[PDB]
Each structure stands twice: as structure tokens, then as C-alpha cells.
């Protein structure tokens, strides 16, 4: 099934680890290698225990100390790595909504790729942490059908995968055909209801039937019928239905596409999926882009930041 690249470290000694981190920061200077070599070789749960022992032994906050010692991208990677797994997605969403503006590629990327079970956990954590309702903050920072689609997904009430009903597959495929290609204009409400609430296994069948009856892949029709945030979200949902690892592998690829690199996106994906499906993401990356994720990162990043990412990612050969 799904496989991550980071797992619990055998022979874990939180207190021992904490002292190593302390010695790497005490006195003038910072031993970045020691810190990165250790934190990327411990699971997220173990990092939290190290943070606890650190505070018990020295009465100091590990994260705050590292924010003082580290700088730049490397610092941001480490801070993201120390973020509790249960709160990371909520943290990112909160920071995509806060301030004047809103990073919609972040809202779209997370809300479309996370399962209903993950979204329920995210909604809870967000509320506890920031004292506000996630849905309400999303509604407040977005509008139109893009907003409605996001709200539909945030309900996390997608139908469960059951036995496939061929007639319902034909019905849904024809409904999409009629709502888009055969309509002057577009019936967005129809696309949202179907793509947002039908079961994954069901939609995979619908996608093939749609192709069969219309000659177009659902992705092409979406591009031909919609635009803006809505188009990006619909494409993300369709891609996620087909394969979450594939979608995220594509999200990463375009992050390091050409000039410069989208570091924020590079960090978020690697960190958030490290203990879930980053291994799968690697395989999908290699199979669709003729290169390994490792190499891509290897030539798109520099310094400690680079060394840290590579250890997390792994797979020098893929
Ligand atoms: Ca120091
Ligand atoms: Ca805003
Ligand atoms: Ca149309
Ligand atoms: Ca378009
Ligand atoms: Ca680049």
C-alpha cells in the first residue's frame, strides 16, 4: 500500500538525542550537519519526544532555539519538520488564509488531495489551535463556484466505495457530457456535486465512460469549459481521484520547473507526506518525468537545505 520514507528509529533515546542537539547549538556557532542528520532520521513522533526531553533537561524550547540558530530555507524546513503531524496541514491552511490575500494553490492542493478521514482530523485540529472554524475562514476568503467546491469537499461526506452500479456510471457520464460539452455555457453545479460527492471507485469508472462517449478525457473538458481557481481545483480533484501520489508528484515537478523553485511547496509536500506516501510519490515521479525526485532536488537546491531534503526524500537511484 502507501509507504513513507521516514519511519521510527530503533534504539531511540530521546534524552540522548536532546543532548546532541544542545551541544550542536551551545556556544558560538551552529553545527547544522549534526542537527539535520539527526532530525531527518527520527519520525515526527520521536521529534516531539526529543522536544519534550530538551525542555525537561534544559528548560529551553527546542524549536525557538533553532529559530535563533538557523536561517533561510534550511530553518523553514526544520521548523516544518518539528511541527506535529496532526497540526501541519492545519498550520499551512491557516497561513494560506491569514493576512490580506490568500494562497489559493495551497487551499486547492491540500483540500483536494486529502481523504475525507484526513479532512475531519484537519478540521478539528484547526479549530482547537486557532479558535475559529476552518469552513468559515475559507468561505470568508473565497467566492463563486471555487468556494462552493471547497465547501463541498470540507464536508468530508464523499460516498463510500461500494459495488459499482453500471447504470449509475452511465447516468453520471452522460450528465457530465450534457453539463459541459453539449451546453452553451456550463452547469458548474453538476460538476461539483458529481466530482465532489461520488465515491472514488465510482468516479474512476465515470472518467473512462466519459472518455468513451465523448472522445475527451475529463481533464480536457474541464480546461475547455472552465477557468480560474475553479479549473485548477477541478483538475486537482480529478487527478487526486485517479491517484493522490501522481497528483503530488506532479505538484512537486512543477515546483522545480525551470527558473528558480517554489520552496514553500517543495517543503510542504516532502514534509507532509514523508510518513504517508512519499515513497509512492517517488515512483510516480520517476515513471512520468523520466527522472528521479532526488536528482531534481539535487540540482535545484543548495547547502544544508539540500542535504536535509535529500535525506528525507531518499532514493538516489529511482
Ligand atoms: Ca549557538
Ligand atoms: Ca486573506
Ligand atoms: Ca459548454
Ligand atoms: Ca482553461
Ligand atoms: Ca528550478
UniProtKB/Swiss-Prot annotation:
S-nitrosylation is induced by interferon-gamma and oxidatively-modified low-densitity lipoprotein (LDL(ox)) possibly implicating the iNOS-S100A8/9 transnitrosylase complex. The modification N-acetylalanine is found at residue 1. There is a cross-link at residue 26 (Glycyl lysine isopeptide (Lys-Gly) (interchain with G-Cter in SUMO1)). The keyword ATP-binding does not apply. GO terms for biological process: blood coagulation; cellular response to gonadotropin-releasing hormone; cellular response to lead ion; negative regulation of blood coagulation; negative regulation of prolactin secretion; positive regulation of apoptotic process; regulation of flagellated sperm motility; response to calcium ion. A motif ([IL]-x-C-x-x-[DE] motif) lies at residues 311-317. The modification N6-acetyllysine is found at residues 67, 73, 76, 94, 98. It comes from the Eukaryota. The keyword Repeat applies. There is a cross-link at residue 26 (Glycyl lysine isopeptide (Lys-Gly) (interchain with G-Cter in SUMO2)). Pfam families: Annexin. The modification N6-succinyllysine is found at residue 287. GO terms for cellular component: axon terminus; cell projection; cytoplasm; dendrite; endothelial microparticle; external side of plasma membrane; extracellular space; intercalated disc. Annexin repeats lie at residues 12-83, 84-155, 167-239, 243-314. Keywords: Acetylation, Annexin, Blood coagulation, Calcium, Calcium/phospholipid-binding, Hemostasis, Isopeptide bond, Phosphoprotein, Repeat, S-nitrosylation, Ubl conjugation. GO terms for molecular function: calcium ion binding; calcium-dependent phospholipid binding; identical protein binding; P-type calcium transporter activity; peptide hormone binding; phosphatidylserine binding; receptor tyrosine kinase binding. Belongs to the annexin family. This protein is an anticoagulant protein that acts as an indirect inhibitor of the thromboplastin-specific complex, which is involved in the blood coagulation cascade. Monomer. Binds ATRX, EIF5B and DNMT1. A pair of annexin repeats may form one binding site for calcium and phospholipid. The [IL]-x-C-x-x-[DE] motif is a proposed target motif for cysteine S-nitrosylation mediated by the iNOS-S100A8/A9 transnitrosylase complex. This is Annexin A5. It comes from Rattus norvegicus.
